[PDB]
Amino acid sequence: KVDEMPGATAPLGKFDPLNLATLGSESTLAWFRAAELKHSRVAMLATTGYLVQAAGIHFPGMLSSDVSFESLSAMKPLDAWDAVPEGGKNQIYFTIFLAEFITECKGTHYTKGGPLPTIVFPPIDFSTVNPEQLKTRQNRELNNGRLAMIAIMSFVAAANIPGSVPALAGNPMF
Amino acid sequence: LSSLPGSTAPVGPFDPLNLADSGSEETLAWFRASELKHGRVAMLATTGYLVQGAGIHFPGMLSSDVSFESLSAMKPLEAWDAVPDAGKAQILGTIFIAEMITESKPVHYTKGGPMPTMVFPAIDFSGVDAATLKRKQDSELNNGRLAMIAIMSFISAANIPGSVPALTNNPAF
Amino acid sequence: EKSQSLPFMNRPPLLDGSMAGDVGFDPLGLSNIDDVGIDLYWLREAEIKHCRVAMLAVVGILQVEIFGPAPGCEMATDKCQMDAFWQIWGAHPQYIAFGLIMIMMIEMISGIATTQGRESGERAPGDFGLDPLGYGKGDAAGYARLQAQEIANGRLAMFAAAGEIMQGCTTHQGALENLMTALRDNSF
Amino acid sequence: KDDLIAIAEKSNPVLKYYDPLQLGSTTIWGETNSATIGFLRQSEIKHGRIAMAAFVGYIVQANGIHFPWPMSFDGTPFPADAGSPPEQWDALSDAAKWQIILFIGFLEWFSEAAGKHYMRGGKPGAFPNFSDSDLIPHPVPLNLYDPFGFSKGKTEAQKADGLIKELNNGRLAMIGIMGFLAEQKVEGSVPLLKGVVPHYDGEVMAPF
Amino acid sequence: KAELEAIAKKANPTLGYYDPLSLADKDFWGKGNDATIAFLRQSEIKHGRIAMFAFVGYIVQSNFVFPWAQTLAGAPHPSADLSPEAQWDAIPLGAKWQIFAVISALELWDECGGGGVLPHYTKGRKPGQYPPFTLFRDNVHFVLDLYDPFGFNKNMSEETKERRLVSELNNGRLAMLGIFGFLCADTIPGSVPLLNDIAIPYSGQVMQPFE
Ligand code: CLA
Ligand code: CLA
Ligand code: CLA
Ligand code: CLA
Ligand code: CLA
Ligand SMILES: CC(=O)O[C@H]1CC(C)(C)C(=C=C/C(C)=C/C=C/C(C)=C/C=C/C=C(C)/C=C/C=C(\C)C(=O)C[C@@]23O[C@]2(C)C[C@@H](O)CC3(C)C)[C@](C)(O)C1
Ligand SMILES: CC(=O)O[C@H]1CC(C)(C)C(=C=C/C(C)=C/C=C/C(C)=C/C=C/C=C(C)/C=C/C=C(\C)C(=O)C[C@@]23O[C@]2(C)C[C@@H](O)CC3(C)C)[C@](C)(O)C1
Ligand SMILES: CC(=O)O[C@H]1CC(C)(C)C(=C=C/C(C)=C/C=C/C(C)=C/C=C/C=C(C)/C=C/C=C(\C)C(=O)C[C@@]23O[C@]2(C)C[C@@H](O)CC3(C)C)[C@](C)(O)C1
Ligand SMILES: CCCCCCCCCCCCO[C@@H]1O[C@H](CO)[C@@H](O[C@H]2O[C@H](CO)[C@@H](O)[C@H](O)[C@H]2O)[C@H](O)[C@H]1O
């Protein structure tokens, strides 16, 4: 199935030096593609959410009744999450849970012969029906998400160990 | 199953523990009527907590010595305690007739018959356009499913503060 | 064939749904007794007499505890009818003894009608021919409904009259204020 | 049911048949659907007919229209000295109210007992004339619908169109008289009647 | 679906047919694709023809008002304040409900189909076409038609309207962001011109008394 799926690009054709695609069944690979894409979409929102919170741009004007948006724009984005109120993080953890509960319980699961998780709300999903154009588009989602997976690990290797990256660690935000 | 009403768009049919096949067809028919009755009771319970929790109350006297002024002054879960014993005897008595009548229909809903319809006033609802009644049965169950979570949240907020983040500093709780 | 009331048990063989309240409820097999002057005829006559005595006893309690005793008996004044008997016996004991000997002649005649009605076949159990309004003349389906309604209200009143004796002889209050006591004690 | 759609199409060619609740397809007392659809037609016509006499009767009794002569044995005229016509129903008497209610209650009775009923072969709203049906022993001179005879000679198509503009003037006066009495108990309830209506503030939905 | 792509052959052959979100093959409310492709066509026709109705409502409402009465209370206008976006609040609230009553009735006549004279746009009718008032005019009183109340057009040949339908939504979508170059030019503005306008109610859509 690893020949018939997106992710195969021109620099590395089918990059699998440990042969972990054919290690399990097709449900194991279908779990792996659903976990590469979910790690892609989180890290793509993570790389964007680090850069637009290190650039200083923020919402107006008060996040809570006590916590402003501008007080979290001054600190680093990895330390701004510690200052989000506990009722606000519970609002985030509830909608994330209710999206994970829905995508794993929508019919014909992805580990079976089913689709990968789509938009929970609102359900449209914007997908092109042209399979020659859509296959390149989801080839573009993966390696942009692959680069964003390395990028957000570079953002936490610059905020924990001073150094570790040449074009960062001179910046009071990363 | 999906031809049944309560199957909807986001999760339909939602049954991860496969409880629908734990019994026979008559067990599922008992499960549907119990979900429908848990829904209708909780929708009256979520609204009865929201209305009496604000201060909306009837004008005048509930009994000879208990007005609605004193019951709205309390939180609703202990407002039931100051209702007179002849007041709960009147409420529980008409529910007893309502539960006896909807059970004593000529075919039981466990055996394929009708689910509990209105007793007093006994408006007929049979030929009310099965396509429109299909959508409205889904909105009865979905509003029942949400209100059952809601009234269980209201009791949990009234005794364990901080159980729900949206009702922490609420004065009705 | 299984009993209707106890579907794990076989049907008792002398009960075949001919009598009014027959749903096969004889687990102890007491309808099979045929020895010490007692058979299914005697038990049905005993059931029907226990039905009718207990039916009159319930409304006989609920008449006095609502509307008071009859005139000539206003010396009662107690809602507990197990205690109000002894105030009528304390003042006008002759009318109770008038009724108790009038019952004694009626019951000894009814005891002859039971045993002669059993040896012959011209008397149903509990039948005395007391149909003066004549409900039994037409609509045998509607007459069997009255035979079942007598048994159904009589079996219910047997528990009620036995209870009002026992919860009158133990609480010394009366049936309707035992009912109000229980309503305020077990209210939720 | 087939004729109820044909009636409402003539009342509005845009809104042909309007039924959100689908109340037109129910029974009430287990009669049939076609017999209760004459009950619903009668009750709509009776609601609109009462409300349209109530709307005229409001604007007469809200202004100062107290007509001579007062018909009593002591005095006690028509109690327009409050004025405010929901207050003026309270200030009649207690015993005068049963004379008004029971007289309408005969006309409610006579529309049920006499010539033909709306939960049968229908024509709802058709009040039976007092001349026929042989139940009243007086007899009385006039009828309720045509006392002076105006106007016999109108064709069927001239009177079939009458109920359709009686139903539409009856539906509007249901909204009309209720917009007055809503401002008698809550102001701002209708937006264009602020300040006109004097806030009766009692209970309009109780006689005594 | 194919008739949508035929309009893009006539709209801009340099760019061409262009859906980035690929909404031309989706379905909304489970009502199918061919109803979805006509909801999308009617929505941007109604978005454009409102924006072109507001683009000319932004260039003369700044510069020229009629001065007469405006109300039965004196102060006989909102007293421009030539910034047009800010003239809406003090109009007052009683006038905004009358505007929101006719547009509630005008858009109720559009999705009606004129009492059933025309079909519905999801089920067959041309999407820009407003149903005429010919069935209301036949019954109640003389009302003028919404599109052409006087009968100036219907002199055209048939091939000219489809070359003007394609000119309409092409002029429509430019005025969609054209009118959004004005009220976005009043809250952290962002443009080369500078100078047009300044105010800060910023949107949405009623003001100080409600909710
Ligand atoms: C961690 C999330 C994750 C997951 C679940 C996958 C899963 C997959 N990748 Mg992807 N990949 C990832 C991250 C991931 N990748 C990243 C970050 C890059 C950029 C380096 C890539 C670059 C890449 C290419 C170029 C290709 C794939 C392909 C595949 C598929 C091949 C099957 C396989 O061998 O599974 C992998 C099995 C796993 C269990 C996931 C790996 C997790 C390891 C075992 C954990 C240990 C890693 C270790 C800590 C090193 C990380 C260092 C870190 C600090 C940066 C499979 C769906 C191929 C494909 O799509 O074919 C169509 C393919 O050609 N991947
Ligand atoms: C009174 C409780 C109750 C009962 C009897 C039912 C019964 C049913 N539901 Mg419903 N449901 C409920 C509550 C209930 N539901 C609530 C509160 C929600 C919102 C979360 C839902 C959401 C839901 C959806 C989306 C669907 C159903 C469906 C069904 C049918 C599934 C078949 C089955 O056999 O499951 C039997 C179910 C039970 C025996 C439930 C009993 C309770 C269990 C044993 C323990 C639950 C404890 C729980 C963990 C505590 C959580 C607290 C809560 C406040 C969150 C069945 C008629 C499906 C349907 O309608 O198809 C026709 C369907 O698609 N349910
Ligand atoms: C302003 C709002 C308003 C509305 C919405 C209505 C609507 C209605 N009224 Mg009307 N009514 C109004 C103003 C209004 N009215 C005013 C201002 C008066 C005073 C003049 C009346 C006096 C009036 C009378 C005398 C009657 C109605 C009836 C009706 C119903 C006719 C359709 C029907 O039969 O459905 C079916 C009915 C319902 C859906 C209502 C359900 C009522 C429930 C079940 C409670 C029943 C309680 C009742 C007292 C029980 C008595 C018998 C019992 C003791 C055994 C309809 C619901 C008629 C009716 O309901 O007959 C069946 C009727 O007889 N109305
Ligand atoms: C189990 C039946 C029963 C018994 C033991 C009693 C006993 C009593 N009643 Mg009560 N009562 C009863 C039923 C009964 N009643 C019924 C059914 C009613 C009507 C609802 C009443 C209404 C009532 C009132 C209003 C009052 C009493 C009072 C009394 C007390 C004094 C009366 C008396 O001694 O009369 C003496 C007995 C007689 C005059 C004759 C008895 C009847 C004879 C035996 C005929 C029986 C025929 C039989 C029923 C059917 C035919 C049998 C056969 C042919 C098959 C006494 C303790 C009074 C009291 O003091 O209260 C504290 C009082 O005021 N009773
Ligand atoms: C790939 C490049 C490309 C191609 C091949 C086309 C092709 C077309 N365009 Mg498109 N368009 C393009 C890019 C392109 N456009 C760009 C970059 C823009 C943004 C400027 C537009 C905006 C646009 C609009 C708004 C319209 C078109 C229209 C057209 C069609 C007819 C144009 C014509 O020749 O009419 C002849 C040209 C005229 C008659 C000029 C009209 C001038 C108007 C009436 C006044 C404009 C104001 C003026 C500039 C200044 C007035 C004075 C001022 C100081 C007050 C033609 C298919 C039209 C259409 O779709 O109809 C079929 C149409 O309405 N285009
Ligand atoms: C044919 C026809 O036309 O009819 C048809 C069609 C038609 C018209 C579409 C219909 C409809 C749709 C309807 C009527 C929809 C309405 C739905 C409705 C009525 C939804 C209420 C939500 C309120 C909430 C969630 C409150 C939260 C409140 C909370 C959480 C509080 O804390 C309350 C509060 O007091 C306290 C407790 C504490 C205070 O510290 C705070 C305040 C003061 C706030 C019909 C009638 O069905 C049928
Ligand atoms: C968005 C949508 O879908 O909407 C749907 C929703 C829904 C609900 C499903 C539908 C419906 C049915 C509706 C709207 C029913 C409402 C009917 C309504 C509003 C009915 C009032 C009648 C007034 C009466 C009977 C009596 C007045 C009483 C009078 C005239 C009197 O007795 C006399 C009096 O006045 C005077 C003369 C003189 C005074 O001295 C004394 C008083 C004051 C006492 C529709 C039609 O489908 C529309
Ligand atoms: C951004 C910008 O530039 O704009 C500026 C300028 C401007 C123009 C001033 C703006 C504005 C004003 C706007 C846009 C105002 C809102 C407009 C809008 C769109 C308002 C929807 C109403 C929907 C209703 C009432 C639904 C009824 C529906 C009902 C009652 C039902 O569903 C039930 C029913 O039908 C069925 C389903 C079944 C039947 O059995 C029964 C019936 C018939 C009862 C802004 C936003 O302020 C700022
Ligand atoms: C289809 C997707 C469905 C997603 C559903 C998501 C529903 C989200 C509902 C969120 C409602 C938030 O409700 C809100 O909770 C916050 C806490 O966060 C409360 O906030 C209150 O308590 C918190 C502590 O708990 C304090 O820090 C805060 O200062 C105080 O105002 C508000 O009193 C309440 O109004």
Tokens (6 digits) for D145: 């619908």
- Residue C69: phi and psi, rounded to 5, are -75, 170
Q: Which amino acid is at C22?
A: D
Question: Which residue, judged by its Cα, is nearest atom 8 of ligand 9?
Answer: A91
| Length of chain A as a residue count | 174
Helix (H) or strand (E) holding D179: helix D156-182
Long-range contacts of D43-46 (CB under 8 A, 24+ apart): D44/D167, D44/D170, D44/D171, D45/D124, D45/D125, D45/D163, D45/D166, D45/D167, D45/D170, D46/D125
Tokens (6 digits) for A134: 């859509």
Tokens (6 digits) for E16: 């061409």
Distance of CA E170 to the CA centre of its chain: 14
> Is the CB of E26 less than 8 angstroms away from the CB of A128?
no
Q: Which residues contact B142 (CB under 8 A, 6 or more apart)?
A: B6, B8
> Is the CB of D22 less than 8 angstroms away from the CB of B132?
yes
* DSSP character at residue C2: B
Q: Is the peptide bond before C21 cis (omega within 30 degrees of 0)?
A: no
State the Cα–Cα distance between residues A115 and C3, nearest whole angstrom: 57
Q: Which residues of B touch D25 (CB under 8 A)?
A: 127-129
Cα torsion through E127, E133, E136, E137, rounded to 10: -160
Report the interhelical angle of B85-103 vs C175-185 (nearest 10°). Answer: 90
Q: Which one, of B43, B41, B45, lies nearest residue B33 by Cα?
A: B41
Q: Is the peptide bond before D69 cis (omega within 30 degrees of 0)?
A: yes
- Residue B97: phi and psi, rounded to 5, are -70, -35
Report the interhelical angle of C40-67 vs C175-185 (nearest 10°). Answer: 80
B49 contacts A140 by C-beta, under 8 angstroms:
no
Query: Residue A7 C-alpha to ligand 5 middle, in angstroms?
Result: 42
Question: Which residue, judged by its Cα, is nearest atom 55 of ligand 2?
Answer: B149
State the Cα–Cα distance between residues B33 and B137, nearest whole angstrom: 12
Distance of CA B78 to the CA centre of its chain: 19
Q: Which of residues 69-128 of A touch E (CB under 8 A)?
A: 124-128
Q: Which amino acid is at D181?
A: L
State the Cα–Cα distance between residues C6 and C27, nearest whole angstrom: 8
Provide DSSP, C13-29: TT--S-STT-S---TT-
- By the 10 Å C-beta count (0-12 exposed, 13-18 middle, 19+ buried), D179 is classed as middle
Query: Residue E44 C-alpha to ligand 2 middle, in angstroms?
Result: 42
E188 touches chain A (CB under 8 A): no
Q: Which residue has the tokens 């002669």?
A: C116
Within B55-166, residue ranges assigned H as helices are 68-72, 76-79, 85-103, 130-159
Q: Find the radius of gyration of the CA atoms of chain C.
A: 20
State the Cα–Cα distance between residues D76 and D82, nearest whole angstrom: 14
Instruction: Give the distance between the most distant pair of CA atoms in chain D.
Output: 57
- Residue B61's DSSP bridge partners are B67
Q: Is the CB of D174 under 6 A from ligand 7?
A: yes
State the Cα–Cα distance between residues A148 and A168, nearest whole angstrom: 16
Please give the interface size between D and E, counted as residue pairs whose CB atoms are below 8 Å apart: 8
C175 contacts C62 by C-beta, under 8 angstroms:
yes
Ligand minimally distant from the alpha carbon of residue B168: 9
* DSSP character at residue B67: B
Q: Which residues contact A95 (CB under 8 A, 6 or more apart)?
A: none
State the Cα–Cα distance between residues D51 and D178, nearest whole angstrom: 9
Residue B42 CB coordination number (10 Å): 22
- Please give, rounded to a whole number of angstroms, the shortest distance from the CA of B115 to a CA of chain D: 18
- By the 10 Å C-beta count (0-12 exposed, 13-18 middle, 19+ buried), D51 is classed as buried
Choosing among D1, D17, D28, D39, which should be mutated to test the B contact, i.e. which has the most B CBs within 10 A? D28
Q: Which one, of E59, E50, E124, E114, lies nearest residue E85 by Cα?
A: E59
**Which atom of ligand 8 is least distant from the CA of E88?**
9
> Is the CB of D13 less than 8 angstroms away from the CB of E112?
no
Count Cα neighbours of B134 within 13 Å in the Cβ-side half-sphere: 8
- By the 10 Å C-beta count (0-12 exposed, 13-18 middle, 19+ buried), C30 is classed as exposed
State the Cα–Cα distance between residues D104 and D88, nearest whole angstrom: 19
> Is the CB of D26 less than 8 angstroms away from the CB of B129?
no
State the Cα–Cα distance between residues C144 and C150, nearest whole angstrom: 10
B123 touches chain D (CB under 8 A): yes
> Is the CB of B125 less than 8 angstroms away from the CB of D27?
no
Question: Which residue, judged by its Cα, is nearest atom 28 of ligand 2?
Answer: B14
Residue E31 CB coordination number (10 Å): 12
Sign of CA dihedral D61, D63, D65, D66: positive
- Residue C2's DSSP bridge partners are C10
State the Cα–Cα distance between residues E23 and C15, nearest whole angstrom: 76
Helix H, strand E, coil C: the string for D86-112 is HHHHHCCCCHHHHHHHHHHHHHHHHHH
B130 contacts B3 by C-beta, under 8 angstroms:
no
Query: Residue A33 C-alpha to ligand 1 middle, in angstroms?
Result: 9
Provide DSSP, chain E: -HHHHHHHHHH-TTT-S--SS-GGG--STTS-STTHHHHHHHHHHHHHHHHHHHHHHHHSTTT----S-SSSSSS-S----S-GGGTTTTS-HHHHHHHHHHHHHHHHHHHHTTTTTS--GGGTS-TTPPPPSTTTTTTT-----SS-SS---S-S-THHHHHHHHHHHHHHHHHHHHHTTTSGGGSS--SS---S------SSS--SS--
Ligand minimally distant from the alpha carbon of residue A18: 1
- Residue C10's DSSP bridge partners are C2
- Please give, rounded to a whole number of angstroms, the shortest distance from the CA of E117 to a CA of chain D: 10
State the Cα–Cα distance between residues A88 and D89, nearest whole angstrom: 59
State the Cα–Cα distance between residues E42 and E24, nearest whole angstrom: 13
Report the interhelical angle of C40-67 vs C81-91 (nearest 10°). Answer: 80
- By the 10 Å C-beta count (0-12 exposed, 13-18 middle, 19+ buried), B163 is classed as middle
Coil/strand/helix, residue B61:
strand
Question: Which residue, judged by its Cα, is nearest atom 55 of ligand 1?
Answer: A150
Chains D and E touch (3+ CB pairs under 8 A): yes
Q: Is the peptide bond before A122 cis (omega within 30 degrees of 0)?
A: yes
Enumerate residues lining ligand 9, CB below 6 A. A 64-66, 85, 87-88, 91, 95, 98, 121; B 165-166, 168-169
- Residue A22: phi and psi, rounded to 5, are -90, 15
Q: Which residue has the tokens 């489809």?
A: E162
Q: Which amino acid is at A143?
A: N
Question: Which residue, judged by its Cα, is nearest atom 35 of ligand 9?
Answer: B166
> Is the CB of E25 less than 8 angstroms away from the CB of A126?
no
Question: Which residue, judged by its Cα, is nearest atom 30 of ligand 3?
Answer: D43
Among D26, D30, D33, select the one facing B125 at the smallest CB separation: D26
Subunits adjacent to chain D (3 or more Cβ pairs under 8 Å): B, E
Question: Which residue, judged by its Cα, is nearest atom 42 of ligand 6?
Answer: B54
Tokens (6 digits) for C143: 């007459």
State the Cα–Cα distance between residues B15 and B133, nearest whole angstrom: 23
State the Cα–Cα distance between residues D32 and E161, nearest whole angstrom: 56
Q: Which residues of A touch B165 (CB under 8 A)?
A: 86-87, 90-91
Cα torsion through B47, B50, B51, B55, rounded to 10: 170
Q: Which residues contact E196 (CB under 8 A, 6 or more apart)?
A: E182, E185
B170 contacts B157 by C-beta, under 8 angstroms:
yes
Q: Which residues contact A16 (CB under 8 A, 6 or more apart)?
A: A2
Q: Which residues contact C69 (CB under 8 A, 6 or more apart)?
A: C75, C76, C77, C84, C88
D44 contacts D167 by C-beta, under 8 angstroms:
yes
Cα E104–Cα E106–Cα E109 angle in degrees, nearest 5: 110
Helix (H) or strand (E) holding A97: helix A86-103
Q: Which amino acid is at B163?
A: S
Q: Which amino acid is at E35?
A: A
Ligand minimally distant from the alpha carbon of residue E104: 8
Provide DSSP, A29-57: HHHHHHHHHHHHHHHHHHHHHHHHHHS--
Instruction: Give the distance between the most distant pair of CA atoms in chain A.
Output: 54
**Which atom of ligand 4 is least distant from the CA of C84?**
62
C50 contacts C154 by C-beta, under 8 angstroms:
yes
Q: Which residues of B touch A108 (CB under 8 A)?
A: none
Q: Which residue has the tokens 């033909």?
A: D116
State the Cα–Cα distance between residues D143 and D124, nearest whole angstrom: 17
- Residue A94: closest C-alpha in chain B: B165
E150 contacts E68 by C-beta, under 8 angstroms:
no
Helix H, strand E, coil C: the string for C40-98 is HHHHHHHHHHHHHHHHHHHHHHHHHHHHCCCCCCCCCCCCCHHHHHHHHHHHCHHHHHH
Coil/strand/helix, residue D199:
coil
D201 contacts D184 by C-beta, under 8 angstroms:
yes
Q: Which one, of E23, E8, E24, lies nearest residue E166 by Cα?
A: E8
State the Cα–Cα distance between residues A157 and B26, nearest whole angstrom: 60
Q: Which one, of D124, D131, D168, lies nearest residue D149 by Cα?
A: D131
Q: Which one, of C94, C79, C97, lies nearest residue C167 by Cα?
A: C79
- Please give, rounded to a whole number of angstroms, the shortest distance from the CA of A159 to a CA of chain E: 33
State the Cα–Cα distance between residues E78 and E61, nearest whole angstrom: 12
Coil/strand/helix, residue C102:
helix
Please give the interface size between B and D, counted as residue pairs whose CB atoms are below 8 Å apart: 17
* DSSP character at residue D23: G
Sign of CA dihedral A71, A75, A76, A82: negative
- By the 10 Å C-beta count (0-12 exposed, 13-18 middle, 19+ buried), D57 is classed as middle
State the Cα–Cα distance between residues E176 and B60, nearest whole angstrom: 58
Q: Is the CB of B30 under 6 A from ligand 2?
A: no
Q: Which residue has the tokens 């039976």?
A: D128
State the Cα–Cα distance between residues D87 and D198, nearest whole angstrom: 10
Helix (H) or strand (E) holding A98: helix A86-103
Distance of CA E181 to the CA centre of its chain: 17
Q: Which residues contact E33 (CB under 8 A, 6 or more apart)?
A: E1, E25, E26, E27
State the Cα–Cα distance between residues B147 and A59, nearest whole angstrom: 34
Q: Which residue has the tokens 């059931």?
A: C47
Question: Which residue, judged by its Cα, is nearest atom 40 of ligand 7?
Answer: D85
Tokens (6 digits) for D67: 């007509």
Count Cα neighbours of E192 within 13 Å in the Cβ-side half-sphere: 0
Percent helix, strand and coil across chain C, each rounded to 5? 55, 0, 40
State the Cα–Cα distance between residues C154 and C46, nearest whole angstrom: 12
Q: Which residue has the tokens 């709306």?
A: D118
- Please give, rounded to a whole number of angstroms, the shortest distance from the CA of D14 to a CA of chain E: 4
> Is the CB of B11 less than 8 angstroms away from the CB of A87?
no
- Residue A106: closest C-alpha in chain B: B11
> Which technique?
cryo-EM
Q: What is the resolution of this structure in A?
A: 2.4
| Length of chain D as a residue count | 208
State the Cα–Cα distance between residues E118 and E141, nearest whole angstrom: 21
* DSSP character at residue D26: -
Sign of CA dihedral D146, D148, D153, D157: negative
Coil/strand/helix, residue D33:
helix
Helices (H) and strands (E) in chain A, counts: 5, 0
State the Cα–Cα distance between residues A13 and D74, nearest whole angstrom: 112
State the Cα–Cα distance between residues E97 and E84, nearest whole angstrom: 19
> Is the CB of A127 less than 8 angstroms away from the CB of E22?
yes
State the Cα–Cα distance between residues C74 and C91, nearest whole angstrom: 11
Residue C106 CB coordination number (10 Å): 12
Count Cα neighbours of C13 within 13 Å in the Cβ-side half-sphere: 2
State the Cα–Cα distance between residues C88 and C76, nearest whole angstrom: 7
Ligand minimally distant from the alpha carbon of residue E201: 8
Count Cα neighbours of A135 within 13 Å in the Cβ-side half-sphere: 9
State the Cα–Cα distance between residues B5 and B135, nearest whole angstrom: 8
Sign of CA dihedral B70, B72, B77, B80: positive
- Residue D13: closest C-alpha in chain E: E115
Ligand minimally distant from the alpha carbon of residue D23: 3
A2 contacts A21 by C-beta, under 8 angstroms:
yes
